[PDB]
Structures are given as C-alpha cells and as structure tokens.
Amino acid sequence: ATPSLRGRLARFGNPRKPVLKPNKPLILANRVGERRRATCITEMSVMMACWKQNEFRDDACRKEIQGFLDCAARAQEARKMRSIQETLLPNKLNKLLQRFPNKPYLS
Amino acid sequence: PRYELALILKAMQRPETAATLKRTIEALMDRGAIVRDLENLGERALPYRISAHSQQHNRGGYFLVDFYAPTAAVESMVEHLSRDIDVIRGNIVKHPLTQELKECEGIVPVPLAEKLYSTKKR
Amino acid sequence: KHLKFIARTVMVQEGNVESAYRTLNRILTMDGLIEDIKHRRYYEKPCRRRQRESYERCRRIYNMEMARKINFLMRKNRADPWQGC
Amino acid sequence: RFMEPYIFGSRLDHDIIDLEQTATHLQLALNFTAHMAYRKGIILFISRNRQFSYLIENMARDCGEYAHTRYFRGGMLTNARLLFGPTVRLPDLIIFLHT
Amino acid sequence: DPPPSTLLKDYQNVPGIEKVDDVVKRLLSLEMANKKEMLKIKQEQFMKKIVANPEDTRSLEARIIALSVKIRSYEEHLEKHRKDKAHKRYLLMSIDQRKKMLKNLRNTNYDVFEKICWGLGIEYTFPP
Amino acid sequence: SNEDLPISMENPYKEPLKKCILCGKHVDYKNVQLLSQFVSPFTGCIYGRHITGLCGKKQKEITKAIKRAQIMGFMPVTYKDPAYLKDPKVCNIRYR
Amino acid sequence: KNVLKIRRRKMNHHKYRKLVKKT
Amino acid sequence: YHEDRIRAKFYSVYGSGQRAFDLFNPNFKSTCQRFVEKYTELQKLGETDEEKLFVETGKALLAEGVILRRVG
Amino acid sequence: TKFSIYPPIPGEESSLRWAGKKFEEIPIAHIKASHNNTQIQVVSASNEPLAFASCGTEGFRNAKKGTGIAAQTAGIAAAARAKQKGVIHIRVVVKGLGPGRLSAMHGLIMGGLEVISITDNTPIPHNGCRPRKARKL
Amino acid sequence: REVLQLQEEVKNFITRENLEARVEAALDSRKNYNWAITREGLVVRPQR
RNA sequence: AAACUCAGUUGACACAAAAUAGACUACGAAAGUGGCUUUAACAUAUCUGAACACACAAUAGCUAAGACCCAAACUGGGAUUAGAUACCCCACUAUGCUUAGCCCUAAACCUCAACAGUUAAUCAACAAAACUGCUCGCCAGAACACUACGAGCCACAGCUUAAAACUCAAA
RNA sequence: GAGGAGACAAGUCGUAACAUGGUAAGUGUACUGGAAAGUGCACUUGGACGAACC
C-alpha cells in the first residue's frame, strides 16, 4: 500500500510538525518521464594479452583475434536488435493518461 | 514488581551449574527477591563470541529466573551478576506477562489523504 | 564476533560466478547495504540526511501512486471499439 | 456535490437516482421539448459518448432535428455568426444525452 | 512515607486478606510495588484526613491533594536528579497550579481551605 | 410511511478486518525462532512492515524484541540463525 | 522570496564585526 | 433493508451458490432471495431466535430441494 | 536436491565436498576492493597465507590501479601464485565496492582457480567512527 | 480471584528450603519458547 | 602531487557513534528525542495571560579537570590558478564526548499565536482552501539599524531592549 | 583628534550574489583573510534531484 499522507504535510489543524516537505505538490501529473538512455572488454584484454606474450604477432593470436572480431560483431548485432525491438513506451503511456487526466479541481 | 532475569552461564558441569544457580538465587533472596520460578533453556552456542571476565565463550547455558523484588534491588542484583565470574551474561527485564494483549481488531485501512491542496485551477 | 561465512554468503551454482555475484548484489541492494555504504563513504550532515529522506519518501509516494494509476488504466489500452465515431 | 438532492441513496457505494424526482424532471423536460418542436424551434442533440454517437445521429435525422456527436470545435455557438455566416440561425433548444 | 508492609490500595479492601500467607502479604505490600502505588496510598490517606467526602475525587479539595502528592513526588525525584530540567518545569508548573487552586478554594470555601492548608502543610502566600 | 424505505443500520456485508498474522499472539524476546522469521537471512536486517505485513503495533513489538534478543545474547545480529532457515516463510521477499 | 534583505543585513553585520575587531 | 442481515449470513454460510444471477429478468429470484423469503415467513410464523430461524430456513429449503452446499 | 544458495551449516552432516574437502576446509580468498586500489590475499582454512596480489604489485600506477583491468590482472597473479601452493577451490570473501570488486574474481578464475562461494564482508558500521566531510566539487 | 490465584501459586515458589530440589529439577528439565508462525496465522510448535 | 612504509588474514580490544526497524509519524512546551535494561517520570483545567518575574533553550563559544577512535575550524605542506589567504589531496590542534559551572544566540521556520467554532454563502497573486468569536503579543515607507547612547546581565571583539540626525521616492 | 552613515561619483583590485551564478544559497556561532569572503559545527528551502519500472 502507498505510504500514508495523513498528517504528514504542514497544514492548518495539524498539531505535529511536518513529516514531509515536498518541494513540489504531491499531485499526479498527466505524463510520465521519458526513458533515460563497455562490452567486449574481456575479449579485448584476452587478445591484448596474447599479443603481449607473442610480441603482437598474429601467428598465435589468430584464435583470440577471431574471438574479438566475433564479439564485436555480436555487440553490433545486439545493438541493432535492441534498437529495433524498442520500437509500455512513454509515448503510449502518456497517450493513455491524457484520456484520463488528473482532476485536482472541481467540475 | 515482577522481573525475569535472563541469565547466560558458563557451560560447565552439573555440580558447578547447580552451585552457580544456588548462589544467584541466594543473592536474589538476600537482596529481597521472592523467586517464583527457574526454567532452564538448555545449553547452546551463543549467537556471538561473548567475552566476559577476559574469558571468551562460544557456548552457554540459558536460564530464566522469574521473581518479585523491590525496585531498589534491581540495580544491586545487576551489579552482583556483573561481578560474578561464572555468569557469561545476565539481564533483568520486566516480566513479559505483566504486559497485556490489548485488542487489535485488525489492520484498519488508511484512506488516501484528502484536502491536502487547494482546488485552484491551473 | 560472529560466525564467519554465514552472513552475505552465496554459494555459486555449477560455477556460474557471474550469476552468483549478480544474486548477491541483488540481495545487498534489496537490503539497502549498497546505498548505505555509498552514503556512509562521506558524512551526511543530519539536515541533509533529513532532506534526502523526505525527498525519497515523497518520490516513493508519487511513484507508487503513478504506478497504481498506470496499472489501473492499463486495461483501457485496448483498441478503440467505437472506431468511426 | 449538486447531485445529492437527486440521489435516493447509496447501495454498496453505488448511488441510486431518485426515479420519483426523475419522473417529474423528465415530464417537464419532455413537455418543454414538445412545445419547442411544436413551435418549430431548432432542437440540437449533443453527446460525446462515441458508443451512442451513431444512435443519436440516426435519431436526430429521423425526427428531423440536428445532432452534434463529434468533437465540439470552440466557438460553434459563441462564434456562430462567423463560423456559419452572419445570418445563421442558432438552435432554440439543446438536448444533452451526455453532459 | 507509608510503611513498606502497607497493602496496596486495591487489596486493602479485599475480604479475608489478613488471613493470607506472609509471602502473599509481602507481594501485595508497597515493598513490592513502584512509587506510584505509594503515592496513591498517600493520596488516599490525605483524602480521608481532610476532605469531607473521601470518595469525591473530582472536587477542588481532591484536586489540590492529588497535586500536592504529585509535587512531593517531583521534589523527591529532583532531590536526586538535580539536572532534570523537564521535571523541574513540571514541579514549578504544579506548584503554580496548586497556588491557583488554593486561591480559588480560598475565594469559594474558606473553612475547607483552612483544613486543606493545615492537612497538606501548605502555607498560602499572596503573590507579590 | 412506507415499509420499503431503507432502514438505518451498519453495513451487514462489511468484511472482517485482515488481522495481522501475529495479532492476538504474544511476541517474546526469547522466541528467537519467531524473531528470526522476520529478518533478512543474509544480512539479519529487520524487514520493513511493507514486507512483513504486520500491523504497526506488532511490527514495533517485533523490532523491540529483536533488539532485546540481539543485545542480550539470544539472537545473532548480522545474520539469521542458520537453524531457522527452513522455518515457514512469512515475509513477502524474493531475492533470487 | 529572494534574500536581498538578508544580504544587506549580512554585509552590515560583517562590516560591524570587522570594525569591532579593528577598534 | 431488514433482509440485508439475512443475505449477509446466507452469503457467509453458503457463498454465492451454483445458480448465477440473471439480472436481465426483472422477476429473477435468487437462492439467497428464496432463503430470505423462507426466513421471513418463518419469522411471521413466530420463531424469534436468529440461529433457530436460520437453521429452520436451511432445513425447509433443503426439503424443498435447494442446493445449500455450505462453504464451511 | 535442488540447489541451495545458503552456505553449508558449520559442524553439520553436509554432503557437499569439493575434491573431498569440507566447506570449512576450503581455502579463502580475501579481496579488498578499495576505491582506487584492489588487493587479493589467499589464505588456508587455518588462515595460513598462500598468495598475495594487488594493482600496485602488478604494476598499475596512480589512477590506473582503480580499474577493472588492473583488478583482473591482480586476480590472475594471485591465482597463479596460489596454484603453485595447490589451491583449487576457494571461497571468495570480498569487502569494498571498488571498480575491481568483480574483475578481481574474474581474474582469479582466469588464473585457473575455481570459486565455490561469494561472501560480501564490506565493513558497514551500524554507527561509529564518523567519516570525513563531504566533498564539494 | 487475583489474590486467591496468587495464594495458590505461592505454594510453588522457590525458597531456601526447596532451593536445592528446584535447582536440580530445573537442571533436569527444559523449556523451549521458540514457535514458528505460518502465513495462515497458525503456530507451528517445535517437536518435543 | 605531496604523505606513510607500511598493507592483508586471524585474535584480544572504547569514556567515541548508535545500520536495518523507519514505506513507522510517536514523545516533549520549545530546543530536541530513533542501540539495550532498570528506577523515577511525562503540570492543571473542562479558557487567555510576563523584558513585569521564574524555569528551559540546537549548534557554536568561555573557565577548570578528564577522555581522545574518528571527524575537524585554524595552521603547515601538495596541487590549482594570472593570483587561490578557497574549492581537490595529506597531517594535525582547538572543538565535537564526560564532569561542574557559565554563555542565552539560530532560516530557534511548519516564517502560519492560544482557546472555541463553521464549511455556510469563497477567494488580490503565490503559498499550506476561506472564515467566525475571544484574548494576548507585535507592526505603521526604505536605509541609517542584529547600529549609536542609556540600562541589565558570571556575558569584556557579547547578548537583550533600541533610537535620532543626514538621504530617497521609492523600498 | 578621529570613526560611522548617507549621498555624489569616476577609477582600482577581484567576481561574492542573481542560472545548479560556475564550490547552491542563507541563519547562528568561532578562526582566518587585500576585498568582496573561505572553512569548521548545527539549522532553513527563501535549491534541485528530472518525479511507473527503467
């Protein structure tokens, strides 16, 4: 259950000192906030260690380098898949809310 | 009034434990307590390594002494328990049964706070 | 003075230390220990602590009420029945 | 707050409109509507309930009176002399099937 | 103070109480009771000593007697807790309330006021 | 007037209040099992009332009893006692 | 509200303390 | 209404019942409604004890053939 | 039995055995993940030292120490040092919330050692020893 | 009743006479205050 | 960068502070009060009422004697900058704690006085909807001015009370 | 004798405040400093923390 707001705020007829001091009114808005906005590092470290121990010569590093390339490709593919899959979203939720606006006044 | 002494004694042999219990109850009576009951909660590993009288303890025997004593005797009893070596720990509390189960019909629902802001239109 | 390896201890299942560490971090986060350590790094003066607690409580109230409203209105996300009017 | 005089009471947190009062109110309203229609005034039905928009429009078209169930553009009555021509005639009675 | 062996006000009216065991008497005595019970016994003694109707707790005399017992308790507390500012305030406020009640009783019923002053050892003094 | 008029009376359909699980039961600082039922298994942190579901009075009593046991040596502080891990789960918590 | 009056009082008080220290 | 207490007890004892509510029928009579009618006519007969009336109504409806399968 | 995340009860008939050793017998890996530095020390069931490592010892200097890469390097070094001591299975007991908190374990694994348990032991004062004043930037 | 009930109990108090017997009896016996609570409000007592 | 050779595990170990509970909204007149136990204890009325007295009054500060983990004005060093008497880093002192006295100030603000009552016909704006009765306290343009003089005070670079001249049409 | 205030008025050194005023601002109190001021302890919002989960 939602925390009780009874007697929390500073109001006339409230003997107790304020429990909450909301810098903004505690009234629901008609909108929600927009969705707020390093991979492959282990593979990079592995490949760099192989380079370090082989004098940065691909001859033995072939495997680690191939793993690095595969990991980079996987990261790019995951980026694309996430971007496409992202498009309830804030736009739809706000559209739903606008049909049922909060009414802090009297009709 | 009525007190319960929760006592944690050094885990020791039956003769030593009996001697310590006799000593503690005798001190209570001398200070004026009227011992009502003595229940043994058994020996068990302490929840943490208590160190009493420079001696560390991992296990101890838990006992309860329900008694009635004058208010002034509680401090003296606490001091004597502290000074007693065989007692790992000891606390005198007000006996729980002196408290009552005053009726609590349930979890009454708290309605959403109303009239917390003016009805001004914006 | 407590028994070691009982508190905040997670047994990694089948060697998936990643999953074990994530579960342990979840446990600590739910218990609030991570936030407690982060705040305790530097002293939070009592007035600032009170202000932060008040702000967090107000934020919790608002977010819980907004989530309640969102869930309550979710059913109305259906397709329009009276299309054409 | 202003519907308290017309609410017979509450049944399980649901209000019951006093049909006793509704009878007299509807008698007066229907008598007034009949008088206006007899006098040939313009009667305009109004309802933003999309469920019954079509039904109200059909009823108005059948009874030879006008209906406005769509989005009510601002000034459609106060600014009518501009939105319809200076000589437009406004409705003589408006019937809100949904207020 | 009343003797420690004094029975609690609740049990002083119990029939056949005198026949009970010595240990039971001790447990029901003030010796095994907090200071509040001793204060209540004191208040009952003052009531039976002074007021015309000892069962009239709501009278001005009963109020004055109870407040005097409370003031005595606060003075006893402060004799030991010399730094208890809250209880110092309570003692001073109680003394002021006793003065006001005594003034009202003096204005209303002078004979009862004399009896109250004598019984509670209060020496009424006019304000400067 | 009219026999069918409503009659003043209390809601006969009112439902009984959902008494908290511990309501009407004696919380004791020695019932270390019950006290451990309301702490975090991993950190020994006392659960909030939103988790426990307890009424305010019983939540306060549970907290005070937990503190008393912990400081008097009846209960551990930093973790739930292992022996009570498999006790019935009455806290609405889900770590895994 | 703004704190212009508090700022004026602040400057007054600071100058007074400085003058007292100086004399 | 007076019958609301009887309705509350009936719903507590036997639940909503197997038979649903056909509110579209203005003259629909529910199992609880028949229980209330039987209770009322028994009260008219004269029984004044609440529990006695409840048990008598249950027995009479069971004889009539009502499925008063108690929830508990 | 389905997996139980809780550690085995001390002094109890537990069936779990790692290379035939009991949980109380498995060696320990104390990781201190300070804000700018990470340190790893492997000790025995009797807290006998087995190996030590840190960002500084591995060679990262100044800000570079407080990085996941340095933590993984220290973990690898500590694991390699412990392997010569014969440590296979270890119970990780990490304290601190530095950037190396998890990279230390990852390096300790890449070095070959297997982890059986993670035990956070970050010192959380219930209250005491007032910390330093807040930084204003 | 309160004084009467107390009168019966006092017979079973610990005094300097039955001190040894009662100490031995307490050592020989045990008391377990632990009992779990289920989500249904039922009290699960430990097996004894 | 300066700085320490000290750092990690385990054990012993406070006169410092009091996670979680607390999404609780309680106690106290206010300041304040959130580890545990005990003792004492939370004025009165079915009103208001004090520079006109008595008792309190966060933090800071003063005197004396102790404690000193940690923090920390000041001070020193490192860094920064055009300069940096600061912001960032390190060390440390008064001080924060205890005892006994002083000091009596806070944006001591919930900037919303106490008691009683109403929601009825509203309301400059914002803020925490608008009012009725009653009593006390306080205010009469801005600045001069938490100032000068006088007075009182364990206060001595202080606190309370507190003006006037000159100036302006504003604030 | 000297200080204080206000006014007139330009320079001077800085940029302390007004925006998160570039270290949020301010109250009390103490130390310090060319100068607005810096910092320490407590207090206020006459700041914000973007206000479902993320």
Ligand code: FES
């Ligand atoms: S619901 Fe009744 S005691 Fe908590």
Ligand SMILES: [Mg+2]
């Ligand atoms: Mg000035």
Ligand SMILES: [Mg+2]
């Ligand atoms: Mg008064």
Ligand SMILES: [Mg+2]
């Ligand atoms: Mg005054």
Ligand SMILES: [Mg+2]
């Ligand atoms: Mg003071």
Ligand SMILES: [Mg+2]
């Ligand atoms: Mg010092």
Ligand SMILES: [Mg+2]
């Ligand atoms: Mg001042």
Ligand SMILES: [Mg+2]
């Ligand atoms: Mg002055």
Ligand SMILES: [Mg+2]
């Ligand atoms: Mg003077």
Ligand SMILES: [Mg+2]
């Ligand atoms: Mg600036």
Ligand SMILES: [Mg+2]
């Ligand atoms: Mg600034």
Ligand SMILES: [Mg+2]
């Ligand atoms: Mg400041």
Ligand SMILES: [Mg+2]
């Ligand atoms: Mg400085």
Ligand SMILES: [Mg+2]
């Ligand atoms: Mg304040």
